[PDB]
Design a protein around this nucleic acid. Structure first.
Length: 48
RNA sequence: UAUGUGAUGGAACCUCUCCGGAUAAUUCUAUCUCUUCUG
């Protein structure tokens, strides 16, 4: 169903610090996606 | 690399003491996936 992609234009905002736990949560979710990909038998070429 | 009328060093066991032990049913159902355009 994909029809249009999104591009992020720059804005004048002050940088905001990132909490340490954010990268841990990102790691957890990024093994979750691949685990679900193998257990769901999805095509790697079309893997979203 | 000695010094000479005098060397049991073959003249001495790395010996003694200590459970690779403890815990675990080869079992089994809820989704997955994010951008759609005024409707």
């Amino acid at each position: 169903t994909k029809r249009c992609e999104r591009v992020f234009v720059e804005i004048g905002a002050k940088p905001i610090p990132i909490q340490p736990s954010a990268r841990e949560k990102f790691k957890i979710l990024t093994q979750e996606y691949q685990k679900n990909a193998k257990q769901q038998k999805t095509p790697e070429a079309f893997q979203t």
